[PDB]
């Protein structure tokens, strides 16, 4: 009965195998078959390659030792190497060409999700090349998905030596019979087999996965498209910035590169961006996912005036000042989308680029009171119910689990009406006391929002809706301006409050506006269609932000 | 009696004035005197320039309006503009050429240090140019040094209008007589003078500073070289990463760009880097100043084994993994310097570059026990006193203020002997109960270290010295390796424990080693000679790390 899956890196989790390159170089350079291959394995266990794999020497120290072996292999071969020969250049591009074998990674991910203990067992080196970051990035990406990474150069043991297998079994705390081991090199499979471990010779991925699926009884081949990597809150870097004596802002941070500031809506969390954070960090960005003022670990003062847009924007500017950031890309959703257009309008120097999900940019009407403007739309009637302090708080704070389960639902799952909510006397009047769990969220994810909202409740979050008149007056100062920095508007087909049609006149204010559109997507864009959101944002960031 | 100083940006805090460029362009392009100057001020209070300065329009919207004014000014002038004319290009380079007037900033800094309320009052615009980051960086740098920044485009008022002066006085909470106002434009000084404010017409900096010094009675001209900008702990972004169930690491973060990880020694803090953090962030780096395991807000487990170098290095690798950093530059001092060479030796793929202050890289002696190696040097006798658990803790924890005041001293201020400390029965045996305050630290800075050390005491910090045998065995695995990634060794002339001579054979292990040397510098390099440390690190980072 299996409970652990072990994978090799070269030829299994990463393709093409760096090993394959030596045979490819020989035939491309019309050299005798296996010559470069011989130089690589010369001296066997006391040879330069074994010393490299054991961590006795670095890759840079090894390069001249392999080069010498190439000369010695030619003396015996009675053939000559051509002029511009560089072992460094061959390995540099071999390593650079090697990419993650995505279907093998997905299978490993699927096995772990079903309760397996996963590990990478690899014969590798200490890379001190000027170009080492490429592989550091690859190892960094792959390792986060496994319980253990066992590298020969760190443990001082190599495959096929039997001690590394006993080391692996001890690390796994599993009997050989409980372990499936996958490798592309027959010689390295043999010692695992002798212990009674299930082994898979990996030639082509599909056959290897077919063998893996047969032997584990779990579906890995032809499975539905997986969700992007999500965030485990306790594994994140948590940051805290005091923006003013009584206001502290909390954020989660991941990656290196240009600063990307994520701004959630109502009633959300930094966690609402869980599917974007790893994807954007992997795409070459430094993600700062905020807990907006009034939410989670951020300060939640009681006063309504603490939540007017001008104050919220000034605080986000102070946040950049204190982190030493001259700019950041601002990406918002719902209330965050509103703040984000206003950041672009009042602080264009601090905004590298601006993107919004669902929230359009609609310029304030100088001739219509914000309350009259709410009158113009039946969808925005819930905003009038939010005006009276205490009313909405009482209903939303009464049962937290019910609140989030009722709100966080895909377009076709809605148990709630946004109409005559004031007439009905609440947004949970027509709703069950025990809502069913939406296909968008696990029970664990709902419970995270519940624990977050237990600290400050809905007062601070509801206060964002309580400054309509102040926001309107402030916005009227920008009526002569245009947004001329890079901008993206992402519309969601099934958002029945923030409808795509509301964005139609945006090009009059943002002439160079870029667009994105998501079909079959409700209000909760980030969790509804994460794969699509990531694809649109990454593509726009690489073209307009970078 | 003065208590506030107000400065203009253009022509006062930033030079050359963007205004100066329009007269320079005219004579370089042989255009009629004042023509470009006329186009800039056209329509006066209802003109495009006033609308720009009030925040009614952005800089990008303004560019075509100024261009039109240049054509209208030519119709009347009866002269023609030449082919390749761009107002954008003229302003782009004018803004780009404009740099901080360092002596004016130092005077403002000196006035604030003496208790003055400082502010910047400027007529500026909303910059939405593709090149806006340049000015964002300049504003970001300047603003942190003042109590207030009042920008015309944010307040919707402009100089010379009287309302901005009443707005300034109200912001300052000061009577005009208590305020000195400096400006390069006579027309903008006049309304401040009418209120009874002390005014300075700024032509050349020296005369303006001469007038300022005379009127305030504080020395600003010919003053000794100021210390670099330090850190106010409550104004920093504080980060927390869980590296393992019982271990959390704390760090302070500032800036954007390549990751620079700062590793303090014994018995220090992230705060030991207070003079480097703002300087390195300003130089284009993302600074991560650590609280090493056992210190400040970082976890301090009691077990000795939790502090062996292998465990400490693995945790720093996990720290990078959790922040999503494939690499960082590692800069260490004392015990941090030791960890930093070991990070380079065991994880070269994760280390972009390595630098050490005072701490040399000395390879473990396979033939000598670490205790015998300590025997070989009288300077390292204090390490034997640190071996017995409880002894050093009791002496160091007895009086915290005495501990730091006695330890943190410049080369010629020492009140302590590092010899026969075990024979004497402590390192505070020959020391006063009330040590004098060293010229290196303020009373406030000592009190910061006192409050930090009150949380966990000296057990965790002393445990770094308690794994000599484990460290020696681990280090022996690297005896065949060389450090071939970019490296910097900075020696301190007056460090009587970590003497420069100890670094002499480092080139045998690190052939491409770069060096730095600081004269008249004790053990506490960072606070002893901050200006020099910053200069050496910035120069090396720009050449080898970037
Ligand atoms: N349209 C008004 C409503 C609102 C909310 C936030 C910021 C500006 C404005 C203007
Ligand atoms: N020289 C030994 C003392 C020490 C301290 C830390 C890491 C390695 C070693 C080797």
Q: What is the CA radius of gyration of chain B?
A: 29
Strand residues in A71-224 grouped as ranges (E): 99-100, 117-122, 148-151, 179-183, 198-201
Q: Pick from B94, B100, B97: which is nearest to B40 by CA?
A: B94
How far is the C-alpha of B87 from the C-alpha of B89, rounded, in Å?
6
**Exactly one of A295, A342, A523, A528 is catalytic; which is it?**
A523
Q: What is the CA radius of gyration of chain A?
A: 29
Q: Pick from B285, B352, B296: which is nearest to B320 by CA?
A: B352
Residues 80-109 of A with CB under 8 A from B: none
How far is the C-alpha of B189 from the C-alpha of B469, rounded, in Å?
72
**Region at B226 (left for phi over 0; alpha for psi -120 to 50; beta for the rest):** beta
* Tokens 């490429």 -> residue: A134
Which residues, in sequence order, are CB contacts of A42 under 8 Å at separation 6+?
A48, A49, A69, A72, A73
Q: What does DSSP assign to residue B437?
A: P
From the DSSP assignment, how many helices (H) and strands (E) are in chain A? 24, 15
Q: Count interface pairs A-B at CB distance under 8 A.
A: 159
Bridge partners for B150 per DSSP = B121
To the question of whether residue B92 is assigned a binding role by annotation, the answer is no
* Tokens 């993107």 -> residue: A355
* Tokens 């496994």 -> residue: A146
A472 lines ligand 1 (CB under 6 A): yes
CB A349 within 8 A of CB B126: yes
Backbone dihedral angles phi then psi of residue B202, each to the nearest 5 degrees: -100, 110
Which residues, in sequence order, are CB contacts of B168 under 8 Å at separation 6+?
B6, B119, B121, B150
Buried b / exposed e along B46-58 (16+ C-beta atoms within 10 A): ebbbbbbbbbbbb
Compute the C-alpha angle A96/A99/A101, nearest 5°: 160
B242 CB near a chain A CB, below 8 Å?
yes
Ligand 1, pocket-test mutation among A356, A471, A478, A483, most atoms within 8 A of CB: A471
Which residues, in sequence order, are CB contacts of B506 under 8 Å at separation 6+?
B360, B361, B489, B513
Across the interface, of B127, B237, B324, the residue whose CB is closest to A323 is B237
Chain A hits for B136, CB-CB cut-off 8 Å, are: 326-327, 349-350
Backbone dihedral angles phi then psi of residue A290, each to the nearest 5 degrees: -75, 150
Following CA atoms B406, B407, B413, B418 in sequence, which dihedral angle do they give, to the nearest 10 degrees?
Answer: 100
* Tokens 């460094």 -> residue: A88
How far is the C-alpha of B348 from the C-alpha of B333, rounded, in Å?
19
How far is the C-alpha of A60 from the C-alpha of A50, rounded, in Å?
15
Which pair of tokens denotes residue A408? 């966080």
How far is the C-alpha of A490 from the C-alpha of A495, rounded, in Å?
12
Pairing of strands A99-100, A14-15: antiparallel
* Ligand 2 atom having least distance to the Cα of B363: 1
A160: cis peptide before it, omega within 30°? yes
CB A13 within 8 A of CB A114: no
Which pair of tokens denotes residue A474? 């402030």
How far is the C-alpha of B267 from the C-alpha of B404, rounded, in Å?
9
The answer to whether A326 contacts B254, with C-beta atoms less than 8 Å apart, is no
Chain B hits for A235, CB-CB cut-off 8 Å, are: 242, 322
For B315-371, give the secondary structure using H, E and C: HHHHHHHHHCCCCEEEEEECHHHHHHHHHHHHCCCCEEEEEEECCCCCCCCCCCCHH
Domains for chain B: give ranges and CATH numbers.
Answer: 1-16+97-217 (3.40.50.1000), 17-96 (1.10.150.240), 236-546 (3.40.50.1820)
CB A198 within 8 A of CB A179: yes
The alpha helices in A290-437, defined as continuous H runs, are 309-323, 335-346, 370-375, 382-385, 391-398, 400-407, 421-424
Q: Is A119 helix (H, G, I), strand (E, B) or coil?
A: strand
Compute the C-alpha angle B217/B220/B221, nearest 5°: 115
The answer to whether A324 contacts B254, with C-beta atoms less than 8 Å apart, is yes
A346 CB near a chain B CB, below 8 Å?
yes
Active site residue B523: yes
Dihedral angle sign, alpha carbons of residues A169, A170, A174, A176: positive
Which residues, in sequence order, are CB contacts of A17 under 8 Å at separation 6+?
A10, A11, A98, A184
Structure determination method: X-ray
Q: Pick from A155, A151, A148: which is nearest to A136 by CA?
A: A151
Residue from B46, B153, B239, B256 whose CB has the most chain A CBs within 10 Å, to mutate: B256
Which pair of tokens denotes residue B395? 């002496």
The answer to whether B281 contacts A324, with C-beta atoms less than 8 Å apart, is yes
Q: Is B503 helix (H, G, I), strand (E, B) or coil?
A: helix
How far is the C-alpha of B522 from the C-alpha of A139, rounded, in Å?
41
Q: Pick from A102, A86, A82: which is nearest to A94 by CA?
A: A86
Kind and range of the H or E run holding B287 = strand B286-291
Q: Pick from B319, B313, B354: which is nearest to B239 by CA?
A: B319
Which residues, in sequence order, are CB contacts of A521 under 8 Å at separation 6+?
A411, A492, A493, A494, A495, A528, A529, A532
The answer to whether A281 contacts B484, with C-beta atoms less than 8 Å apart, is no
* Tokens 């000014």 -> residue: B73
How far is the C-alpha of A267 from the C-alpha of A300, rounded, in Å?
13
Which residues, in sequence order, are CB contacts of A231 under 8 Å at separation 6+?
A252, A271, A274, A277, A278
Q: Pick from A291, A144, A96, A152: which is nearest to B325 by CA?
A: A144
Stated in angstroms to one decimal place, the resolution of this structure is 2.3
* Cα atoms in the Cβ-side hemisphere of radius 13 Å centred on A493: 11
Backbone dihedral angles phi then psi of residue A72, each to the nearest 5 degrees: -65, -40
To the question of whether residue B229 is assigned a binding role by annotation, the answer is no
- Residue A258: count of CB within 10 angstroms of its CB: 18
Most distant CA atoms of chain B, gap in Å: 95
* Tokens 């803090």 -> residue: B269
Across the interface, of B140, B326, B477, the residue whose CB is closest to A133 is B326
* Ligand 1 center–CA B97 separation, angstroms: 38
Kind and range of the H or E run holding A63 = helix A59-77
Across the interface, of B136, B234, B322, the residue whose CB is closest to A349 is B136
Strand residues in B389-453 grouped as ranges (E): none
* CA A336 centroid distance within chain: 19
Bridge partners for A329 per DSSP = A260, A353
Alpha-carbon distances of A495 from A173, A373, A462, rounded to whole Å:
49, 20, 20
A207 CB near a chain B CB, below 8 Å?
no
**Exactly one of B183, B334, B528, B544 is catalytic; which is it?**
B334
Q: Pick from B116, B121, B112, B329: which is nearest to B229 by CA?
A: B112
Which ligand has the nearest atom to the CA of B310? 2
Which pair of tokens denotes residue A88? 């460094």
Which pair of tokens denotes residue B35? 């023509």
* CA A185 centroid distance within chain: 33
The answer to whether B348 contacts A55, with C-beta atoms less than 8 Å apart, is no
Q: Pick from B355, B292, B311, B294: which is nearest to B474 by CA?
A: B311
For A130-173, give the secondary structure using H, E and C: CCCHHHHHHHHHHHCCCCEEEEHHHHCCCCCCHHHHHHHHHHHC
Which pair of tokens denotes residue B125? 């615009």
Give B105 to chain A, closest Cα distance, Å.
18
How far is the C-alpha of B306 from the C-alpha of B462, rounded, in Å?
12
How far is the C-alpha of B18 from the C-alpha of A59, rounded, in Å?
53
CB A8 within 8 A of CB A184: yes
Burial of B517 (0-12, 13-18, 19+ CB in 10 A): middle
Chain A hits for B320, CB-CB cut-off 8 Å, are: 140
For B166-221, give the secondary structure using H, E and C: HHHHHHHCCCHHHEEEEECCHHHHHHHHHCCCEEEECCCHHHHHHHHHHHHCCCCC
How far is the C-alpha of A42 from the C-alpha of A461, rounded, in Å?
68
Which ligand has the nearest atom to the CA of B468? 2
Active site residue B334: yes
Which pair of tokens denotes residue A5? 């899956």
How far is the C-alpha of B493 from the C-alpha of B529, rounded, in Å?
11
Kind and range of the H or E run holding A532 = helix A530-540
* Ligand 2 center–CA B398 separation, angstroms: 29
* Ligand 1 center–CA A370 separation, angstroms: 8
The answer to whether A58 contacts B234, with C-beta atoms less than 8 Å apart, is no
* Ligand 1 atom having least distance to the Cα of A476: 10
> How far from each other are the two terminal CA atoms of chain B, in whole angstroms?
50
Q: Whose CA is nearest to atom 5 of ligand 1?
A: A471
Bridge partners for A328 per DSSP = A351
Which ligand has the nearest atom to the CA of B307? 2
Residues 109-128 of A with CB under 8 A from B: 126-128
Ligand 1, pocket-test mutation among A370, A376, A467, most atoms within 8 A of CB: A370
Q: Pick from A533, A543, A531, A540: which is nearest to A492 by CA?
A: A533
Which pair of tokens denotes residue A10? 């070269």
How far is the C-alpha of A497 from the C-alpha of B65, rounded, in Å?
39
Residue from B255, B319, B324 whose CB has the most chain A CBs within 10 Å, to mutate: B324
Q: Is B228 helix (H, G, I), strand (E, B) or coil?
A: coil
Active site residue B465: yes
Compute the C-alpha angle A360/A366/A370, nearest 5°: 65
Q: What does DSSP assign to residue A225?
A: P
Which ligand has the nearest atom to the CA of A334? 1
Q: Whose CA is nearest to atom 7 of ligand 2?
A: B471
CB B331 within 8 A of CB B540: no
Which pair of tokens denotes residue A236? 């994140």
Pairing of strands A237-244, B237-244: antiparallel
Buried b / exposed e along A456-470 (16+ C-beta atoms within 10 A): bbbbbbbbbbbbbeb
Chain A hits for B286, CB-CB cut-off 8 Å, are: 256, 286
Helix axes B335-346, B309-323, angle to 10 degrees: 70
Across the interface, of B127, B154, B482, the residue whose CB is closest to A348 is B127
CB A125 within 8 A of CB A234: no
CB B134 within 8 A of CB B95: yes
Compute the C-alpha angle B315/B321/B326, nearest 5°: 120
Q: Whose CA is nearest to atom 8 of ligand 2?
A: B471
**Region at A420 (left for phi over 0; alpha for psi -120 to 50; beta for the rest):** left
Across the interface, of B56, B139, B350, the residue whose CB is closest to A136 is B350
Bridge partners for B488 per DSSP = B355, B514
**Exactly one of B183, B295, B523, B528 is catalytic; which is it?**
B523
């Amino acid at each position: 009965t299996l409970r652990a899956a072990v994978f090799d890196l070269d030829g299994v989790l990463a393709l093409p195998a760096v090993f394959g390159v030596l045979g490819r170089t020989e035939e491309a350079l019309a050299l005798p078959r296996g010559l470069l291959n011989d130089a690589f394995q010369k001296g066997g266990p006391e040879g330069a390659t074994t010393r490299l794999m054991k961590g006795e020497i670095t890759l840079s120290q090894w390069i001249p030792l392999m080069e010498e072996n190439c000369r010695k292999c030619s003396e015996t071969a009675k053939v000559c190497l051509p002029k511009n020969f560089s072992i460094k250049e061959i390995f540099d591009k071999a390593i650079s060409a090697r990419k993650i074998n995505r279907p093998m990674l997905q299978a490993a991910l699927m096995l772990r999700k079903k309760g397996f203990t996963t590990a990478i067992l690899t014969n590798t080196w200490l890379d001190d090349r000027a170009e080492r970051d490429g592989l550091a990035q690859l190892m960094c990406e792959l390792k986060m998905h496994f319980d253990f990474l066992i590298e020969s150069c760190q443990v001082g043991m190599v495959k096929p030596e039997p001690q590394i297998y006993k080391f692996l079994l001890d690390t796994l705390k599993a009997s050989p019979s409980e372990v499936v081991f996958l490798d592309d090199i027959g010689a390295n499979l043999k010692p695992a087999r002798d212990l009674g471990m299930v082994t898979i010779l990996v030639q082509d991925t599909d056959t290897a996965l077919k063998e893996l699926e047969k032997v584990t009884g779990i579906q890995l081949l032809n499975t539905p498209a997986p969700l992007p990597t999500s965030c485990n809150p306790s594994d994140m870097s948590h940051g805290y910035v005091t923006v003013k004596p009584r206001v502290r802002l909390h954020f989660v941070e991941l990656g290196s590169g240009p600063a990307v500031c994520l701004c959630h809506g109502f009633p959300e969390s930094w966690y609402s961006w869980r599917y974007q954070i790893p994807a954007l960090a992997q795409a070459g960005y430094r993600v700062l996912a905020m807990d907006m003022k009034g939410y989670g670990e951020s300060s939640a003062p009681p006063e309504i005036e603490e939540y007017c847009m001008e104050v919220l924007c000034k605080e986000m500017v102070t946040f950049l000042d204190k982190l030493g950031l001259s700019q950041a890309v601002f990406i918002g959703h719902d209330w965050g989308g509103m703040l984000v257009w206003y950041m672009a309008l009042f602080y264009p120097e601090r905004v590298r680029a601006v993107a919004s999900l669902n929230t359009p940019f609609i310029p304030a009407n100088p001739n219509m009171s914000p309350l009259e403007s709410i009158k113009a739309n039946p969808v925005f009637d819930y905003q009038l119910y939010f005006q009276e302090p205490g009313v909405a708080e009482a209903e939303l704070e009464q049962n937290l689990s019910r609140t989030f389960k009722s709100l966080f639902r895909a377009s076709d799952e809605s148990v709630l009406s946004m109409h005559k909510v004031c007439e009905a006397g609440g947004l949970f009047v027509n709703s069950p006391e025990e809502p069913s769990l939406s296909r968008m969220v696990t029970e664990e994810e709902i419970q995270f929002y519940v624990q977050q909202f237990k600290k400050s409740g809905f007062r601070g979050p509801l206060n964002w809706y309580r400054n309509m008149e102040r926001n309107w007056k402030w916005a009227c100062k920008s009526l002569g301006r245009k947004i001329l920095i890079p901008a993206l508007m992402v519309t969601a087909e099934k958002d029945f409050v923030l409808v795509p049609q509301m964005s139609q006149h945006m090009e009059d204010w943002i002439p160079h506006l870029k667009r994105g559109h998501i079909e079959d997507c409700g209000h909760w864009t980030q969790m509804d269609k994460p794969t699509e959101v990531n694809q649109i944002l990454i593509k726009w960031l690489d073209s307009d932000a970078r």
